[PDB]
Amino acid sequence: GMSENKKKFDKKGAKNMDEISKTLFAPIYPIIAENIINRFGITAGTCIDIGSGPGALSIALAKQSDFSIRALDFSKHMNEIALKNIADANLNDRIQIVQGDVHNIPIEDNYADLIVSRGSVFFWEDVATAFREIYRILKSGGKTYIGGGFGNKELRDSISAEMIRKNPDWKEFNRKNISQENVERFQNVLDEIGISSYEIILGDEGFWIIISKTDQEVI
Numbered sequence: 001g002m003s004e005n006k007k008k009f010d011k012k013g014a015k016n017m018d019e020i021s022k023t024l025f026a027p028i029y030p031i032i033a034e035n036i037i038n039r040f041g042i043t044a045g046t047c048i049d050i051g052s053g054p055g056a057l058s059i060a061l062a063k064q065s066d067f068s069i070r071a072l073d074f075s076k077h078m079n080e081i082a083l084k085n086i087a088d089a090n091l092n093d094r095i096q097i098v099q100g101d102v103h104n105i106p107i108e109d110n111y112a113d114l115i116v117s118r119g120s121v122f123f124w125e126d127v128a129t130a131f132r133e134i135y136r137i138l139k140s141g142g143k144t145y146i147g148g149g150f151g152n153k154e155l156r157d158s159i160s161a162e163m164i165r166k167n168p169d170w171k172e173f174n175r176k177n178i179s180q181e182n183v184e185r186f187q188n189v190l191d192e193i194g195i196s197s198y199e200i201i202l203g204d205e206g207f208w209i210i211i212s213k214t215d216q217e218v219i
């Protein structure tokens with residue numbers, strides 16, 4: 001017997017993500033990057049983009065800041081595309097592609113000034129372990145922006161209409177992702193870890209987990 005197989009984040013899936021990233025979703029990346037810059041005022045140092053995929057968020061951040069960026073993704077197929085995209089954009093000097101998993105990040109302790117992630121958290125198995133790793137690699141005084149969304153209401157609404165036409169079931173998955181179910185879920189995850197300082201936000205720009213590493217309250 002034989003089979004032809006399709007699974008998430010494989011070569012075919014990476015191509016689909018890349019195509020959408022370059023077309024329908026393209027405008028969201030500069031907006032999200034701008035939102036991140038404006039929110040925290042971090043414009044240099046080290047930034048880790050977790051679940052970077054075809055690399056569009058990293059590329060947008062590079063174009064608006066002076067960060068040294070590492071784009072971490074567990075899919076070889078995503079990383080092959082991201083490498084090409086980064087090179088095409090003349091950003092090889094700005095963004096390093098790192099093959100690896102959020103559950104065992106190949107980065108030293110206390111390294112990152114900023115950790116960002118779009119559209120990955122909703123897929124992670126073992127989120128407690130993932131968030132312990134995220135906290136481990138975050139520098140004291142560092143910030144995160146981990147979640148999903150479209151940057152602003154106008155883009156959210158226009159893109160959603162098109163996504164629903166293409167992929168009707170996306171409507172319900174997106175509705176589950178960008179909601180209070182995840183605010184509750186992730187509050188509970190961070191609380192089990194014992195994180196002293198965070199915000200989890202939900203609004204027109206999306207759903208985002210914003211951890212601040214600070215000297216802890218229990219001493």
Ligand SMILES: C[S@@+](CC[C@H](N)C(=O)[O-])C[C@H]1O[C@@H](n2cnc3c(N)ncnc32)[C@H](O)[C@@H]1O
Nearest residue numbers: 009051052053073074075078101102118119120
């Ligand atoms: C929907 S894509 C989003 C891609 C990109 N961040 C963007 O917004 O265009 C989700 C990505 O997370 C990656 N991913 C999923 N689980 C992961 C894990 N445990 N560790 C690292 N990457 C992961 C996938 O391979 C995929 O590239």
